[PDB]
Amino acid sequence: RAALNQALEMKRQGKREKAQKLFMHALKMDPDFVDALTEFGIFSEEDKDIIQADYLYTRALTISPYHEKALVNRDRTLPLVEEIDQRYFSIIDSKVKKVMSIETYYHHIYHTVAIEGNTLTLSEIRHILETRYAVPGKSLEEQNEVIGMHAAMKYINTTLVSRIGSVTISDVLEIHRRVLGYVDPVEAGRFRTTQVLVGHHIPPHPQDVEKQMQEFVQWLNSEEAMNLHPVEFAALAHYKLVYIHPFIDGNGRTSRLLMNLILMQAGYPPITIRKEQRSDYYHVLEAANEGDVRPFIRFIAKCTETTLDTLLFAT
Amino acid sequence: EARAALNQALEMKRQGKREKAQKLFMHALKMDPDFVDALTEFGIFSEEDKDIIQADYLYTRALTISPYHEKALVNRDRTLPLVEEIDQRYFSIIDSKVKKVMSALRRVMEETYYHHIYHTVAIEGNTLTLSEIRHILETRYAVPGKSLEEQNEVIGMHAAMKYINTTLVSRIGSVTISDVLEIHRRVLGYVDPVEAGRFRTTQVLVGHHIPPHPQDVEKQMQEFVQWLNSEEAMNLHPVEFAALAHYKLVYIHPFIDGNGRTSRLLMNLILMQAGYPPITIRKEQRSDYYHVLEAANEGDVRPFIRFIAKCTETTLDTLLFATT
């Protein structure tokens, strides 16, 4: 409460830089502080950050749903953010049109394995897949992760992308069998049998994983999922597979391959979440676990625009 | 010219020159390997050097073409129970050496653990050395300038035999089809995870042998595992049973790859369950090993059973000498 009142004294005087640090400290000490969430929200609106403000008012109302200062702001920002979000998707739709009218295989294998902790370079990955000979001084596990990724995405492109019909549970297992096959052939293509902790997240118990996955693939084929914008649907699918955590390993890699399978089936190019975005990528997943999937959907959307901007660099 | 080479070999055998006779006998068989008269005459010739095992093989080979050939029949009826005894006597020699090896032994056995992975992969064409295999399994880091497939074959072998030792050797009950598939899932898994632990779906040629069609593989494997658990297989000497199992899995050829590796792991699973140590067929014996499998495909499994038996005696002699 003292750090909040200290942040308000700075905001009233002028010092913006010292206020944000004092605001962030009050939320680090108590992240469910209803009054600091609303005051940091109205503060962020002064820098034209309405997306952040709405996040803060929604976080406030999840704790105290009848908080007058959060409710009065939430109700104003809610339809406004919905529009801002729709407008960014229509910007992405026009860039997909321009791309569709108009080397990268190794770049995606590099970022999908590097974001998980793999120390192999792009030139080393190229040597592994072109020659099929080992890279000196690197672990065989890291080199097998690369081989399995190449197998998984060659299978998706050859058998799943252009195929007509619903996505099955067998397709998810077939992808995982190739992702984790060369590293762990015993556990590759089969569900997790033990309960674990993933950071600060407890996924479903192994006895609930099969049903949770039957429900997930039922959602993937539902009309509600089709009605969504491809970028939202691709992002929600990615998140839900990471939430279920159906395998002991290779969940992030399979969820990123399912995400691009959804995008490629919608006429979008395959998307890459770069190594450098590891921290940003885990921050939005944490926020989705805490209660709001929108920051994640926006992170995936920005990833699609950057990919389209790189492809739009040709006539 | 085949009949002339036979009569030329008889001329030297009658006079004396035995070195020139064997070369002339072998030439008549190279020209025509289904020559009934040269097989009997070469059989009687080999008995003069006290080689009754070779003689019976030759008369047996001659009667698989012409079953009523008087000179083959009269000698085969004579040598048939004779080799049966000689064969039984070599197994009892092996049984006494198994006893003696059951009376550093643990450190010496694990010292030749990388030694078994080297020979089972080297006999299949793998170019990795024993020191390279040791680096792969101890460090889990890659060996420079070698293919990842060859290095994954080594990792899969280590996984397969660590799984056999930890969950199958001391296990009670019948051997299942799932146990064969589980071994294969580890043998091939790191090389080919798509085909590892599943039967072959295409028809192929393996040297000069056509194995069962993929639509018959499941039924022939159900029949094989039924034989493995039968009382007839239990009544056999462990060395004969281990060798016959090895041969029958190689004959079926149930997987697209790793058939030789899995058949040699099942061979030792049978031996270890019988109180025998794990056996190794060395890289140098590649040609001898394929010669006895060819003879078993042609009609006689005995040379193969004798090859496996001499492999167990050499393994027991190494264990009896290392602890001396």
Author numbering:
A (entry chain A): 107 to 208, 221 to 433
B (entry chain B): 105 to 207, 214 to 434
Quoted from the paper:
AMPylation (or adenylylation) is the transfer of AMP from ATP to a Tyr or Thr/Ser residue in target proteins. Interestingly, in eukaryotic genomes only one FIC-domain containing protein has been identified to date, HYPE or FICD, and it is strongly conserved from C. elegans to humans. Here we describe the first crystal structure of a eukaryotic HYPE encompassing the two TPR-motifs, an α-helical linker, and the FIC domain of the human protein. We demonstrate that HYPE forms stable dimers with structurally and functionally integrated FIC-domains and with TPR-motifs exposed for protein-protein interactions.
Almost the entire structure of the HYPE construct is composed of α helices that represent the main secondary structure element of the TPR-motifs and the FIC domain, with the linker between them consisting of a single α helix. The crystal structure of HYPE reveals the interaction surfaces between the FIC domain and the linker α helix, and between the FIC domain and α helix 2 of the second TPR-motif (TPR2 α2). Overall, these intramolecular interactions likely result in restricted flexibility for the molecule, where the catalytic site of the FIC domain and TPR-motifs are accessible to cofactor binding and protein-protein interactions, respectively. The crystal structure of HYPE revealed asymmetric dimers with an interaction surface formed exclusively of FIC domain contacts. The TPR-motifs and the linker are not involved in dimerization, and all TPR-motifs are exposed for ligand binding. The initial TPR repeat in all HYPE structures exhibits a high degree of disorder when compared to the rest of the structure; this is reflected in the high thermal-factors for this region and missing side chains where the density is poor. In the structure of wild-type HYPE, the inhibitory glutamate, Glu234, from αinh is positioned in the vicinity of the catalytic loop. The position of the inhibitory glutamate (Glu234) in the structure of wild-type HYPE is consistent with its role in competing with the Arg374/γ-phospate interaction. The structure of HYPE shows that αinh is held in place by the rest of the structure, and weakening the interaction of αinh with the FIC active site could require significant conformational changes to move the glutamate away from the active site. The low rate of autoAMPylation of the wild-type HYPE could be due to autoinhibition, consistent with the mechanism proposed for a number of putative FIC AMPylators.
